[PDB]
Write the structure tokens for this entry.
Amino acid sequence: EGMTRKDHGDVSNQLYAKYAIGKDAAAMKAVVGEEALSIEDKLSLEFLEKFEKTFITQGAYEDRTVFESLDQAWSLLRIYPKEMLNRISPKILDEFY
Amino acid sequence: EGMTRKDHGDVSNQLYAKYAIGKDAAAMKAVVGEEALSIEDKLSLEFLEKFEKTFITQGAYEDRTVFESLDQAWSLLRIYPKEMLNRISPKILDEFY
Amino acid sequence: AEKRTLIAVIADEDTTTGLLLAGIGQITPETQEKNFFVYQEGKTTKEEITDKFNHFTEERDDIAILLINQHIAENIRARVDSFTNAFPAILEIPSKDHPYDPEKDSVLKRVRKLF
Amino acid sequence: VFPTRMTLGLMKTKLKGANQGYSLLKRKSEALTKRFRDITKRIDDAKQKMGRVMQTAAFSLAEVSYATGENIGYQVQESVSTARFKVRARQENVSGVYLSQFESYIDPEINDFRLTGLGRGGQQVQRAKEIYSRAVETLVELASLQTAFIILDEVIKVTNRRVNAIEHVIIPRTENTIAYINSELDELDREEFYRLKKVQEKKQNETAKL
Amino acid sequence: IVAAVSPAGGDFSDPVTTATLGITQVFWGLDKKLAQRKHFPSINTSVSYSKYTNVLNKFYDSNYPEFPVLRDRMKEILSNAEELEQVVQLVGKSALSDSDKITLDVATLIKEDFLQQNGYSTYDAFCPIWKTFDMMRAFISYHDEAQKAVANGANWSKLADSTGDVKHAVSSSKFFEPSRGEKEVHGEFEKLLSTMQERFAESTD
Amino acid sequence: IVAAVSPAGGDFSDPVTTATLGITQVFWGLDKKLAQRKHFPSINTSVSYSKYTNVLNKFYDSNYPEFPVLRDRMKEILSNAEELEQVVQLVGKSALSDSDKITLDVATLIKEDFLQQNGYSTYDAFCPIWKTFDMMRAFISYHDEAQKAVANGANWSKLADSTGDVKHAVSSSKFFEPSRGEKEVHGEFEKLLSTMQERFAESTD
Amino acid sequence: IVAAVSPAGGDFSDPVTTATLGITQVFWGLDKKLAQRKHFPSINTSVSYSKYTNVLNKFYDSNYPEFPVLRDRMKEILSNAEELEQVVQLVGKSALSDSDKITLDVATLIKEDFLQQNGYSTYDAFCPIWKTFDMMRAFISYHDEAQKAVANGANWSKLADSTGDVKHAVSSSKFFEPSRGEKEVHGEFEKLLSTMQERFAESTD
């Protein structure tokens, strides 16, 4: 703490696992179509596009402090319910969705 | 054009592209089944054999006129619509085909 | 897709009569060949059902769904099993005064193995 | 036999093609069999349900045929020359594959047939058609799943063969070929250095003695 | 310095190429399969980079063009096509999203008009930046209108059939030479944008 | 000069094999899978050649044999068999037609019966020029009759079932001595021709 | 001697890893997956062997533990289970019997109790020979009776609802002291045998 937060470790687990699943979902979408896809895969897809286009993407002269990064992370993960978030302690999950 | 024709370079260019697709379609045909085939590809599979066994084949003693060669090229190409062609300018095509 | 809008029947006489009244089948006005086949139980040879089977599935093409009685379908078991197409659909329903049997149902057998 | 000098690059991409196919095709297979199971339980029930309805409508029609003292069915066969209940076909994407679905229409431009007015026997047929049109509608609406089912049954069998084929044959062929070429390849680079070192040793001897 | 690199043993794993890529900041691809098919020079966005890009698109912004915006979309159309092609080869087509089909179609247009040109474009003796920008601008506008059009509801097929006249017109672009508008800005392409907008109107409703 | 060579590299691309392959006139390949089943010496048409065959076949034609026509038909039966065999393993035999189903089967018989020359007899090890001809003739007559019969209306399973005993008799033919009939041209092979012809009438109808 | 080996060329085909596996008679696999799941070590019976095993268990057999019999039966249950999982994937659970479902449960226990550790208690931190022995004795004891009872007219669902308290107790043994029965022979197990027998009377009836 004091250059990180406590909630840093749990989040690192949620975002990596969800992201991986997001890549797998993109391939499945191309095959099944948009009007025949799963709910769980649909969520994973939405996450892939936002994750890429907000978390990873930053501007040339835009500084991303670690505290700043962690907030953007909660917006992305929010789309999943609490039921699908679980590599996060319920303590954290209740603080920040 | 004075000892060949202007279409000599165009008619050659068409026959490479079609032969190339026919060859990839053949490889895919073995592995997956006839599931990855499409209309152009089925046509391309026939083209491959047609070309191989009429065009390339000839006797040891046999010799060939270049102008002759060019009518046999056109013949093989006659089994494809013209809208699917694009390695020949539409001016050139109209004259000799 | 759409190129078929008759439902053909292989069934006992009463069941068929009823179905026609309700309006599903017809006797065509330019072929003059029925697009239904009535059956007198036990009084009609197994060979006549088979000709009629071929007729709805193959020799006709305006048949959408082929309805067939379990009692009858069993007699000509070989021909039904060998038919595996979806054009027309094969749907076996219980015969009159006969209960369900999974083994007079050609499709259910097929599905069970190789699941 | 396959090219020795830097096949590695193409052969690696072959592996990546293969690999992508196992995961994706397995997802696709997984999803089709998950659906297949859902249909299975529906179709099984629907067979029993159609049978009960068909036997009950058939018995009411039979009773009537016998009471009037003439066989209605003959009368009925002349009059049938159209069908009220027909189907209209649609292709529906259930996963990537197109299945046949049907949606039923009742022609309102189609009148009642004339098999009534027979006297007391005519009342009996008139009540009879009304139960039967309701009954027959059941059979067709339930039947729409069957055609989709049969197709689903054929396609899953093909998709199942393809996963097994890429997994067992294709991927290990890419491994073994890659390896064969690797082993020759590293040795061409190594032996060269040894050849150089052997010639240089002779050279150092001569030069040193001067 | 334009220095040609080519094989000295392997395809790119030869010493020459390995060293040169290290030091070069601009690389423009050339695929062999497309070469035999006659679609050279073929630039592949995975086998191509420029490190000069950021200073260069800001330079072209000063010159007049919107250029940086067009670059990102050009990249996106080529980029998704390669991944969707890999699903096409293995699985096949029995389904391929409404959006995914559009990307493939438009990428063909880009191949044919740009990538293929070497004695096949009757004007190629010197092509201005504005004209390139104007041509690509029509392609990208056709793309965004098309994907919106399937989503707000309208079949993919109705959308191909109605776009019709303009679609051919972009297909034919390559032969056209500055002869309308300015000396570098071409009217046939400027006309094209507005007609495109009218096609979208017919196509959505 | 007949010379055996071997790898020591576990490939066929090694110097020893390669330098001989360059120079050699006739090449008799080695297919490890067939040999694993035992078929000494083991070959396919795709791994072997004789540049000398043409001039040899005209010479054999004078001698009695129908040899030229049989050389072209032999290559053709093996070559078709190879392509279809990939399709069967991966996709299924479901795509294949009954004539091509036959192609695998006649070809299998040729593998077991020809290639295998280890024997436990000198009749299963020595096959005279005449004995080799009769055998090949008998087998092609089967294949041609077989593709026709299924064509005008018969099955691969049904056809297989009717010849049945007559198929075993051609398999076991090889064991029989060559010193009988006219010389090695037996009456045993000549009668067999008639029985194939008869079988053809049954099979079709 | 315990030596770690790792890729030396980015492959496991490195001379080192392959040379040492030859010399050693013990091989114990290690996985990323089991470590993320919090099983430390990570040894499975598919990625391991020990040929020293015959002599060791024999040694153990002397002291008090029934070790040799128990251990062979443990290897087999984990092996047989893997195969039964593959069916769950393809067909599903509508082609598996009560007896096959039972194999899965026992296997889950073996894995849970032995393989998964993380220092949960000062009972995972150190375990004697005796506690290891009591754990497996309990799992096999349940396995034979349970399968026997489904053969005699019971259901996996039935076995599950009645077993309840005794079954959770064997799963949790790893958190509790082994010092309950004596001082290093565990009482939580010794009482279990009697309850499991009693359990089975109720289950059959």
About this structure: Residues 120 and 175 of chain F are 9 Å apart (CA to CA). Strands of chain F lie at 26-27, 49-50. The radius of gyration of chain F is 19 Å.
